[PDB]
Amino acid sequence: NIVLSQSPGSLAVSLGQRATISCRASKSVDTYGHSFIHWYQQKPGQPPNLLIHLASNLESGVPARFSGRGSGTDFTLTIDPVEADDAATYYCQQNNEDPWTFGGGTKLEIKRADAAPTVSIFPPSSEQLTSGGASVVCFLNNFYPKDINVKWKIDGSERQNGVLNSWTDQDSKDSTYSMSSTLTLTKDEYERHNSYTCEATHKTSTSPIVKSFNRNE
Amino acid sequence: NFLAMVDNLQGDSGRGYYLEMLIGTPPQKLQILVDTGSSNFAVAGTPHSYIDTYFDTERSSTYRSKGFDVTVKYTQGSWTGFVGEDLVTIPKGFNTSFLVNIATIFESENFFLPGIKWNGILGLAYATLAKPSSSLETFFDSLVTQANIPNVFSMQMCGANGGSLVLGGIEPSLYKGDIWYTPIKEEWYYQIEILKLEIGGQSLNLDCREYNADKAIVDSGTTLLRLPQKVFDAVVEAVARASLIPEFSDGFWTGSQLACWTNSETPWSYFPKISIYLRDENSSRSFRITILPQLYIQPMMGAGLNYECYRFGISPSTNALVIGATVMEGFYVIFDRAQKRVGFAASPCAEIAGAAVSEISGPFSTEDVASNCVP
Amino acid sequence: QVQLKESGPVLVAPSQSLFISCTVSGFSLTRYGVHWVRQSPGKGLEWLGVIWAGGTTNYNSAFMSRLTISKDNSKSQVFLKMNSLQTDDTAIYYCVKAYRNAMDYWGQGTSVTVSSAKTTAPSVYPLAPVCGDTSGSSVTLGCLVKGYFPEPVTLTWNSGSLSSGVHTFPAVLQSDLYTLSSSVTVTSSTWPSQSITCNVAHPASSTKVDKKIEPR
Ligand SMILES: CN1C(=O)C[C@@](C)(c2cccc(NC(=O)c3ccc(OCC(F)(F)F)cn3)c2)N=C1N
């Protein structure tokens, strides 16, 4: 087994700048002076897609912003200038020997301007209440960078248990991330309290963005 | 007499071309590698696992110790021996005996390797590379003095079966067409000026100084064409753009499997020609030596098989650009020290299935390149 | 136009056998090989094996004890069969067209979950904005999809017509069930004048659910 090791695991690069990502093979991938290693791009929710054949041959229909170099055990993919659409994970894959193997991949993050989240809070639906459940949802949309903290407060008091968080992948068009936080409680616990609050802290401000509602009001 | 020297070499590029020599009194027969990349005559002076025979000084009545030792270091190895002098005869060429400096090697690292048939080395470069110093007269300088031959030697390698080392001049039966001559830039190694590299008619578009960055040399003691890392990268990049490798399919599913071929099928037509442009003795002009895939996609297997495996005959160097035996196999090479020039001509022995494996053409203009490409 | 389409069991119990078909279009299996590749958080992308034009198969040696690839040229289909399943065989399984010395066209992939847990329909809830909040220039609505198994679900807004301004979050596994949510943001002049509905289908339980977002 030839092992492929990509570095770095993750890279943030500004629009219009140069991205360089590396692949190291554990053994030479060369025969007849050709390197049997290939570069693929994988955008979120899609399969990978071949960009560079045999280390350095740019596939037809792939922009000239992409180029591959290397020989022996050391290969690089370069993207220059970087565009928004380039937000994806890049993989090298070898087939000088069997089995064919892939590297662990490199996520290219587009380093757009910092942006504060747009925050929205959502009481349980009347449908879910009629049915005896109580979920409170907060969406923190269209922010950068990805690091963000959400605090749930019930009647001014902080709750840590029962919170489930999911982040989207970086948006291909505006380069932002979005995140969702769901606080789950029993209907009876929910009806014991009046005010529900989700607080977002992000480096775009020293004070949290606070969204709140009062039950039955 | 140059005709008596035809086919005086045995061997191949991979493990060396070697000349038979009789040393001392009575004559001890040794097998000497022909190395245009060094400047000492040095032979095994003690047993070694990878040699059959060695020169025993205590058995030559004519041997004289010169009272000092000598050591040589190179990239991955070295050797050490004692220095003396003795009478040497070259059966094929020089039946008269002459007195030469000889180093007798008692210790070495990565010098005598398994697979070789030689037990000594004849360095044919300049005195300035001689150890311990340039005052240790070169074998060929001794020969020139004592045999009064011209300060010229030429080499043909027929491994692409032996070859010829013509000491004292040029043998017309060993080439066809014209000799093209390029200046020796510095007399240490045989250093010449490379102007441009071309892969399938397409130039690399590197600064010409990249080919000479350290130095470009002609070295019969190097097997492969060795290229500085940057030039290597550009060459293999160009080869991949120009080649036409088959697609993976039934019975061919890894790159490794590209190495061996059955049913008389060869990999050659999938690969581009490689051309090196050298500056002519006339500055405005250049000529170009070309190698076909036949030369740098080299067969590997012992005899009696109905398939063949091949190896890429080009590798990275850290410093020198080395025109090794790979390339010299395509040409008759004249080391005209008297006139500070290296000549190249087409070898008729350099053919596969009656078809040429190398080309030489010129003149080409040098208007578009710097007047000096050696930094 | 080259297309590959995988069809497999979304859910299969451990020890049991996996069988996936790949129906191809726009090229012939008599001219091109088809590879199988899978992808999982834990093992990344693994090349499983290939079946070439002439029917030769080559396999990843780690899988050879349990993997069989085959094809039916006259049905334009390629087949994967794997035995002795384990939970870390959970992955997206792709069939991929051979090309030169690599691979060009991939199917969209089929999600395979290896586990003994049972199939469960999701509960779907419309999320309208807080009652009586200011009617600003834009408005965010949401859809909560809760307590399903296994992955995947597919969520659209207005049957897929409404795609501007949508974020659909990756499912998170909680107490062996799945929850995901989606938001959509539109102008004030859009909602509530226009009907806005999330549509949620969950293959594994053959449920299709529509929930219209209503002002509270
Ligand atoms: C190229 N060259 C040199 O580097 C020095 C010299 C004297 C020469 C002549 C004959 C043999 C050698 N030996 C080698 O080049 C050599 C052999 C094996 C080596 O190591 C390989 C490994 F360590 F086994 F991997 C390194 N160098 C050198 N002449 C040359 N032309």
Side-chain angles (χ1 to χ4, degrees), chain A, chain B, chain C residues 2-216:
Chain A
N1 270 67
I2 302 188
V3 183
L4 302 177
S5 176
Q6 291 179 251
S7 67
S10 186
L11 189 72
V13 171
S14 286
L15 288 171
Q17 297 292 305
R18 167 174 286 244
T20 290
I21 66 165
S22 296
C23 182
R24 166 63 79 117
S26 61
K27 206 179 330 204
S28 176
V29 290
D30 291 1
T31 302
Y32 281 26
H34 287 74
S35 308
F36 290 81
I37 188 154
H38 321 276
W39 288 96
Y40 294 81
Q41 177 197 242
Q42 185 177 32
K43 294 171 168 193
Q46 288 181 4
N49 171 65
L50 181 69
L51 301 167
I52 311 277
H53 189 244
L54 296 166
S56 54
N57 298 333
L58 177 62
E59 275 301 293
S60 156
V62 175
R65 328 185 276 100
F66 295 89
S67 72
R69 296 169 182 81
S71 69
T73 54
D74 309 340
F75 303 85
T76 61
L77 173 76
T78 303
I79 311 164
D80 193 6
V82 161
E83 286 170 13
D85 186 72
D86 301 325
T89 296
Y90 297 82
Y91 296 95
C92 51
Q93 171 257 302
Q94 72 80 37
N95 42 30
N96 203 40
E97 286 181 32
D98 69 308
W100 292 20
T101 48
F102 287 84
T106 288
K107 177 165 273 155
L108 174 60
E109 179 189 322
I110 297 318
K111 181 153 61 158
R112 60 154 289 144
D114 285 0
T118 303
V119 181
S120 311
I121 190 164
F122 292 91
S125 66
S126 55
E127 169 159 356
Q128 185 189 18
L129 282 172
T130 303
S131 75
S135 290
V136 191
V137 176
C138 274
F139 295 130
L140 290 62
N141 286 150
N142 295 284
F143 60 91
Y144 186 90
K146 194 185 181 181
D147 188 36
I148 196 152
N149 282 306
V150 49
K151 195 175 297 171
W152 282 101
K153 286 184 179 181
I154 300 170
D155 282 341
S157 288
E158 164 172 24
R159 165 70 80 97
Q160 264 151 153
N161 312 128
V163 173
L164 301 168
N165 300 317
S166 172
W167 281 254
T168 57
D169 280 304
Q170 190 169 37
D171 186 85
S172 285
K173 290 253 195 59
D174 75 358
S175 303
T176 68
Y177 298 86
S178 284
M179 197 227 51
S180 174
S181 197
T182 300
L183 168 68
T184 307
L185 302 170
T186 83
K187 176 184 184 153
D188 280 23
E189 169 130 64
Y190 168 77
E191 290 183 333
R192 289 191 227 150
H193 301 278
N194 192 52
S195 81
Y196 290 93
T197 282
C198 70
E199 284 191 354
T201 329
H202 185 253
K203 68 169 299 188
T204 49
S205 185
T206 42
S207 46
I209 303 168
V210 186
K211 287 287 147 155
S212 270
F213 71 89
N214 303 300
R215 197 180 52 78
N216 278 347
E217 173 198 304
Chain B
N1 168 30
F2 304 145
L3 260 183
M5 293 173 202
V6 163
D7 306 320
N8 59 5
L9 304 180
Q10 289 191 300
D12 50 50
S13 80
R15 298 282 218 257
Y17 289 85
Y18 60 93
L19 171 81
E20 181 183 300
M21 285 191 205
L22 300 189
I23 311 172
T25 324
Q28 291 170 60
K29 176 161 77 191
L30 286 188
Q31 306 299 315
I32 312 295
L33 169 80
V34 169
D35 182 20
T36 66
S38 64
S39 295
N40 287 78
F41 181 48
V43 304
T46 61
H48 188 276
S49 318
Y50 306 138
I51 68 172
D52 271 340
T53 171
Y54 65 97
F55 181 58
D56 180 13
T57 60
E58 289 178 319
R59 284 208 287 94
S60 178
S61 48
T62 40
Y63 173 92
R64 189 181 72 83
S65 162
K66 278 185 153 203
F68 56 91
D69 64 335
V70 60
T71 184
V72 158
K73 265 203 103 317
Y74 45 82
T75 294
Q76 291 171 81
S78 52
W79 65 259
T80 305
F82 301 105
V83 185
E85 60 175 28
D86 213 339
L87 293 166
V88 169
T89 296
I90 303 168
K92 286 193 94 284
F94 295 91
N95 311 145
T96 306
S97 84
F98 46 95
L99 180 65
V100 304
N101 290 316
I102 186 152
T104 43
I105 304 164
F106 61 81
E107 160 184 313
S108 66
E109 172 157 339
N110 284 332
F111 184 70
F112 301 119
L113 287 203
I116 71 178
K117 289 295 291 186
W118 48 270
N119 33 58
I121 187 181
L122 164 57
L124 297 167
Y126 293 94
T128 175
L129 296 189
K131 293 295 149 170
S133 70
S134 56
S135 72
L136 193 72
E137 191 186 50
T138 272
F139 188 111
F140 192 68
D141 292 332
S142 294
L143 176 52
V144 162
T145 309
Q146 302 177 44
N148 288 111
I149 55 160
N151 189 20
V152 184
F153 70 85
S154 48
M155 189 169 340
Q156 182 174 58
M157 287 162 31
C158 311
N161 270 306
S164 303
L165 176 67
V166 179
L167 299 165
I170 304 164
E171 172 48 57
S173 54
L174 303 176
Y175 66 110
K176 252 83 164 51
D178 332 312
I179 302 149
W180 284 86
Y181 286 106
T182 187
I184 291 162
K185 283 290 284 172
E186 178 100 325
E187 299 150 295
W188 53 340
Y189 303 90
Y190 293 106
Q191 173 177 4
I192 58 176
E193 175 179 22
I194 286 165
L195 299 187
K196 202 203 275 178
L197 256 64
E198 200 172 67
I199 309 301
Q202 179 73 67
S203 72
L204 290 183
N205 309 324
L206 285 167
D207 188 287
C208 71
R209 278 167 291 173
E210 305 277 22
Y211 309 115
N212 302 275
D214 184 51
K215 52 182 182 280
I217 68 156
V218 179
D219 181 12
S220 80
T222 288
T223 295
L224 298 185
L225 172 67
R226 310 192 57 237
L227 307 175
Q229 194 61 62
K230 272 212 76 207
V231 178
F232 186 78
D233 299 338
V235 166
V236 298
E237 191 137 329
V239 168
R241 267 195 317 279
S243 72
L244 280 156
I245 284 325
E247 66 197 31
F248 286 142
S249 189
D250 303 82
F252 173 49
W253 59 294
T254 72
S256 284
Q257 289 169 358
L258 188 65
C260 311
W261 296 76
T262 54
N263 298 154
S264 279
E265 214 164 347
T266 59
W268 295 321
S269 49
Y270 301 158
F271 284 81
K273 281 169 193 192
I274 300 173
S275 275
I276 301 160
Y277 291 81
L278 300 163
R279 189 184 302 283
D280 187 66
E281 277 194 299
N282 172 353
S283 269
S284 51
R285 288 154 87 254
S286 63
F287 63 94
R288 163 192 85 185
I289 51 176
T290 304
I291 61 173
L292 311 216
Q294 282 80 330
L295 269 188
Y296 71 91
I297 301 287
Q298 305 162 335
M300 276 197 284
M301 300 313 294
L305 293 167
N306 80 355
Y307 68 97
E308 188 56 82
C309 305
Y310 301 79
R311 66 153 186 187
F312 195 58
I314 313 167
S315 66
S317 186
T318 43
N319 45 274
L321 195 155
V322 191
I323 302 183
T326 285
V327 181
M328 290 180 62
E329 250 147 11
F331 306 98
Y332 187 46
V333 193
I334 298 86
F335 297 84
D336 187 355
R337 303 149 51 94
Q339 302 183 45
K340 205 182 173 153
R341 57 193 194 161
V342 176
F344 299 81
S347 315
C349 80
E351 289 188 334
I352 301 289
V357 307
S358 62
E359 307 166 359
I360 184 166
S361 58
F364 298 87
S365 165
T366 63
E367 293 146 18
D368 55 329
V369 58
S371 55
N372 201 332
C373 289
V374 187
Chain C
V2 176
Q3 312 177 322
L4 301 79
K5 299 182 183 175
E6 294 88 349
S7 180
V10 38
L11 178 61
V12 69
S15 90
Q16 283 303 74
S17 270
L18 169 63
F19 170 84
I20 311 173
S21 80
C22 176
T23 298
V24 305
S25 149
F27 69 101
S28 181
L29 300 177
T30 61
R31 298 158 52 91
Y32 294 98
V34 170
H35 296 268
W36 284 96
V37 170
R38 71 174 189 188
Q39 187 168 32
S40 56
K43 278 151 187 288
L45 283 157
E46 310 175 85
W47 175 80
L48 298 182
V50 59
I51 182 157
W52 299 112
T56 293
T57 59
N58 299 108
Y59 290 115
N60 181 322
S61 64
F63 297 87
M64 75 192 309
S65 74
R66 56 194 201 108
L67 168 61
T68 298
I69 299 166
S70 74
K71 56 165 197 182
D72 189 327
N73 291 329
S74 69
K75 289 185 187 293
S76 327
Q77 282 181 129
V78 178
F79 310 111
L80 175 147
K81 193 165 101 62
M82 198 162 59
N83 297 325
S84 306
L85 301 176
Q86 35 196 70
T87 47
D88 74 359
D89 286 324
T90 290
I92 308 295
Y93 282 81
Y94 295 99
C95 54
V96 194
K97 182 195 156 280
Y99 167 82
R100 300 185 181 261
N101 305 291
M103 300 174 271
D104 54 7
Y105 286 90
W106 303 59
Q108 281 307 296
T110 197
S111 169
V112 176
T113 304
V114 181
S115 137
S116 42
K118 206 191 80 64
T119 290
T120 320
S123 289
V124 183
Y125 305 122
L127 303 180
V130 176
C131 188
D133 257 358
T134 317
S135 286
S137 61
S138 72
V139 60
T140 300
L141 311 170
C143 180
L144 184 72
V145 178
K146 197 180 159 47
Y148 68 93
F149 190 93
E151 283 266 77
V153 294
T154 58
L155 186 153
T156 60
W157 294 92
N158 287 352
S159 311
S161 314
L162 175 52
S163 64
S164 168
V166 170
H167 301 282
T168 298
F169 301 88
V172 287
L173 181 63
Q174 160 67 237
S175 301
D176 314 323
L177 298 174
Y178 281 102
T179 314
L180 70 61
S181 52
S182 173
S183 69
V184 51
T185 295
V186 298
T187 71
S188 55
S189 83
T190 299
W191 189 92
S193 291
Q194 300 169 35
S195 176
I196 292 183
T197 304
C198 65
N199 331 100
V200 183
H202 182 232
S205 57
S206 274
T207 45
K208 132 173 194 155
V209 170
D210 296 306
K211 285 295 181 259
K212 173 176 177 193
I213 316 300
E214 307 269 31
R216 305 183 186 256

